[PDB]
Symmetry: D3
């Protein structure tokens, strides 16, 4: 790992529902990973970067309104103009019964439930590379 | 190909901007691909399905507010409970100068600009497979 | 018509629900027609234009979360600074039972269902008229 | 007029921008009128109703981020299952210079600037008509 | 009190749901009060201002999809660079039964139901103060 | 403190802009604190709870598109049916120059910038209290 893991953490609201049955779409995870990758790029070379693509993405468990979610990302490799990262999505809390709209019961996921994994890469043009912006990334280096 | 190509077509509005500079995030393409994938699954087996994952997503050109975009998807292979699909994203029109907010000029992209490509797979549990629901998919078959 | 038909095609997600019961509002159709009209104006004279208004709008069938929708528009006539257009909205797929949130069943609409029609006009100031921008519109002419 | 005029009043935020240049789409006005029509129908017969269509929607002045807007609606004629309503949209305040994002100056529109008008009709099936729900509509009468 | 009361008035749509059970979050009220405060600041000194904070906020009744809501605000005191305002939120109509998605019955709240109150302050830098912009605020003066 | 601190962490996208100049509204912070408070209530007693109100919200620094933000919350006191919590908002990264939309430079905030503080209380009806749901909260007790 280059630098530190970045962790996003937030709640799926009703506004994150996408398909019927309060089901959140898998792209909601990819949305967040885009922002996680962005934060990694700000720290490693001071640019918001452009996302190049994903080698793979697996959606491993469904996500619903009322789920509290964490999104983890870290840099595995610093290339020339590319940076290769790994990503995870974890569910840390949920409604007890999503099928009952009037049920307010909720609980923690112990252990958290893996909802997604990915490998993806981001781009910062050489002339946009400004060096580390955050202390845990001070030792990052290009080949 | 099994069945027909599904084509989504719409505009990026200011609401689709994500990063600064009116830059739309890559995940917006993935969002649309989720819906294209859903339509394919509705037609092939009558269920909105669950997205399993992607292989080799590439974001090949930046997308901005005011871009008109098409998203193509089709079923390459029908598995047991999985369906493997190909996806594309195409830009067909754009603002001439996104850096000038008061500039209202826009033009077509001839030829269209390729903005995204991916392979993705969706899942329908055997008990939820209801057979083709759209005429062009009528001859789809599982192994 | 002047030029070619513009066709938008997308899904109503949970985010498009407006009234209770997963009912989409009629204005969602008008939103899309605005973007269809914009695209037509980009092609006929290279400007995003200003919508002048609608002579008539009819909402002919209800639209729900999970509906796949098409929106058609074309130019009927080119005026001096105004362009008169016709619009349609069609439902091509839907959930089987929107009243059951856990029902994942969906199907095509065969035949498609008419959901709306309209006549509306858009405006491009004379000095903003840049001529056709797309090959099918090459013969578009002002009086 | 039957009953009272219903007045919605709110601000266009950055989230209401639709086209480039912080321009709000005309459909934002129609979105609001749909909710105004709904409120009138709640008051006259106790149902959220269904919008039948519009005549003569006219967008008469542009609307931008930072505009404060009022939307007026009222019932002009009570029919059998239809209700004919009039709608207005008024700008009551605005940014002084929308072209300068760092300019925080804003002022009132005195007199208010007319931004839209329409005639629209709504439908409540006879078996869903429950009579007036709001005191000012107490004497509304069907033929 | 200085000037006139500002009244925003709109509908809670499905898009305003936040928690399960079509429950709107308290922050939706605070969102609206921010815009009410902004409008007051435009009228009293011609600047959109910056919100300083809230002395207190109380959420007194729950708000649901299909509720029609008013948000009142007024200037209690003009200070030097600060302005002390009072806010209320009122429910004026609602669905008859939110637990039944397909139910279209709705009614007015007579009298309206108090849903929230707050005291909050806004800031306009001395050099950004431009004097009253709306006639009812003509006697609004700084000490 | 009762239990542990909950930390939400995410990015302000263009979708979070509210006023002109890419300025996020103060209520965006309150929105997040509502979700932070919900998480706390889920862990302490297994219910999403209702927010009672706030005392002394202060917005201490402005927030813009492109800001990465953290929102901390914790339980200070467990009451009978109320829970009193402290909330903070922290800026951990930002665009270098928000006034140039095409500038992609970004940096960390070291140290983080305090953007908001508040005390807020939430409510869980006695019969809805189900005991701690997350190990760090296991010893939380009512009077
Ligand atoms: S729509 C919202 C976004 N999507 C989601 O929420 C889905 C979350 N994921 C899940 O709930 C599970 O992964 C589901 C979809 C139920 C799959 O369960 P799982 O235990 O992987 O099923 P399984 O091992 O029996 O496999 C069934 C078929 O799918 C295939 N599969 C599995 N993973 C992938 C993948 N990453 N990419 C492509 N295909 C995959 C398996 O080969 C198997 O195929 P087949 O049935 O032999 O045709
Ligand atoms: S953020 C919004 C979403 N993302 C976007 O809009 C990006 C759209 N795409 C683009 O504009 C271009 O693809 C950009 C990002 C400019 C890349 O330009 P391109 O000409 O492809 O770069 P290049 O071929 O010189 O390669 C540069 C470095 O990136 C790598 N790269 C390329 N493609 C991938 C990929 N799919 N997955 C992983 N890495 C990729 C190249 O190997 C090269 O690496 P390095 O510089 O040798 O370390
Ligand atoms: S709210 C979401 C947006 N709106 C919708 O989803 C509504 C979609 N449309 C529908 O489901 C149907 O068109 C509904 C609303 C049921 C109307 O059915 P329809 O078969 O047109 O009813 P109908 O022909 O018996 O007419 C009954 C009354 O309505 C009138 N009407 C009809 N069309 C219009 C129109 N375009 N503009 C104005 N009024 C219209 C008829 O004159 C008739 O009036 P009355 O009952 O004699 O007062
Ligand atoms: S896109 C966001 C939504 N739309 C807007 O914000 C537009 C707001 N409206 C405006 O700013 C003005 O109405 C604009 C568009 C500039 C037009 O100026 P205005 O003074 O109304 O036009 P004008 O009277 O000079 O007429 C010019 C051409 O347009 C036509 N026109 C006018 N109103 C309508 C209407 N309701 N329906 C159809 N056509 C209309 C006039 O006939 C005239 O046509 P032509 O140039 O002779 O072909
Ligand atoms: S989540 C969506 C946003 N929130 C909402 O919609 C909540 C709307 N409000 C309501 O429905 C009611 O106010 C609810 C939450 C039921 C409270 O009812 P109320 O009649 O005030 O209850 P109560 O007086 O028995 O008080 C119970 C405990 O709460 C406390 N409380 C009351 N108001 C406040 C306040 N403004 N700030 C802080 N605490 C408050 C009371 O002291 C009492 O505390 P305790 O149970 O003695 O520990
Ligand atoms: S709109 C987006 C949401 N709001 C924001 O982003 C604002 C972020 N905060 C800031 O940038 C600063 O707090 C701003 C607003 C510039 C205020 O600067 P600051 O240095 O705190 O002001 P100051 O201490 O000189 O006080 C100026 C006047 O305001 C008052 N004030 C201050 N804090 C509060 C508060 N929490 N509640 C009520 N009033 C407050 C001060 O008493 C002073 O008042 P006056 O000028 O004597 O009338």
């Amino acid at each position: 790992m280059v630098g530190k893991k970045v962790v996003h953490h937030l709640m799926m609201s009703a506004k994150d529902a996408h398909y019927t049955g309060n089901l959140v779409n898998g792209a909601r995870i990819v949305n967040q990973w885009g922002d996680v990758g962005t934060e990694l790029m700000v720290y490693v070379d001071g640019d918001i970067s452009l996302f190049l693509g994903y080698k793979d993405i697996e959606f491993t468990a469904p996500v619903y309104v009322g789920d509290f979610m964490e999104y983890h990302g870290w840099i595995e490799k610093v290339g020339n103009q590319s940076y290769t990262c790994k990503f995870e999505a974890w569910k840390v809390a949920k409604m007890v019964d999503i099928t009952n709209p009037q049920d307010t019961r909720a609980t923690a996921c112990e252990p958290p439930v893996l909802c997604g994994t990915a490998t993806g890469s981001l781009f910062i043009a050489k002339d946009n590379q400004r060096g580390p912006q955050e202390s845990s990334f001070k030792d990052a280096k290009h080949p």
